[PDB]
Amino acid sequence: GHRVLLYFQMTRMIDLMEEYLTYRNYKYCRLDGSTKLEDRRDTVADFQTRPEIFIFLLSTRAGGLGINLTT
DNA sequence: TAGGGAGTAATCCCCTTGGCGGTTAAAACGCGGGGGACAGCGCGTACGTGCGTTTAAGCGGTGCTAGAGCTTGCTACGACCAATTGAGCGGCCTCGGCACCGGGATTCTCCA
Ligand code: ALF
Structure with a gap:
């Protein structure tokens, strides 16, 4: 549970990772420096709302600061 | 020895291209007929050809002097740059010019 x-240092790897995560059954969401600011709020609040999501795919720099991921 | 350039990839703002939907106005399609394209014809006059005349353009020659083209000397003036500021650009604001509409009046066409 x-x-x-x-956390990834490369954007191309977090693409490949969700190809793997969709070959498996793992429910995931993604945040990186290319996601737009309202999309970042929504994904962070989505992951922090509902326990259904398993893996937060998360960029080192854009996802590494400021946000709360305490769940 | 160190500083800053080379490499690279993530980050995030700007902006141009493309699609969806409607809807609506302009392009496409039809067809009658008209009148303008165009062929065919007559004349006449106006332009090319030819011959004799003249006129003056072009070539060979002489003489002159203006002025283009070059050298010299110097100082005036525009390039140059450091210090100063105010003219002119970028951003923001608003109101008044102009357009667009509607309906009543005058103009212009075309057929009788
Ligand atoms: F210091 Al933080 F999010 F970890 F502002």
Whole structure:
């Protein structure tokens, strides 16, 4: 039941990672420096709202600061 | 020895292209007929050809002097730059010019 944050230094890898995560059955969401600011609010609030999501795919720099991911 | 350039990838703002939907106005399609394209014809006059005349353009020659083209000397003036500011650009505001509409009046066409 360990909801989990994955940090990447490369954007192409977090693409490949969700190809793997969609080959498996893992429910995931994504935040990186290309996501637009309202999309960032929504994904952060989505992951922090509903326990259904398993993996937060998460960029090191854009996702590394300021936000709360305490769930 | 160190500073700043080379490499690279993430981050995030700007902006041009493309699609969806409607809807609506302009392009496409039809067809009658008219009148303008155009061929065919007559004349006449106006332009090309030819011949004799003249006129003056072009070539060979002489003489002159203006002025283009070059050298010299110097100082005036525009390039140059450091210090100063105010003219002119970028952003923001608003109101009045002008357009667009509607309906009543005058003009222009075309057929009788
Ligand atoms: F210091 Al933080 F999010 F960790 F502002």
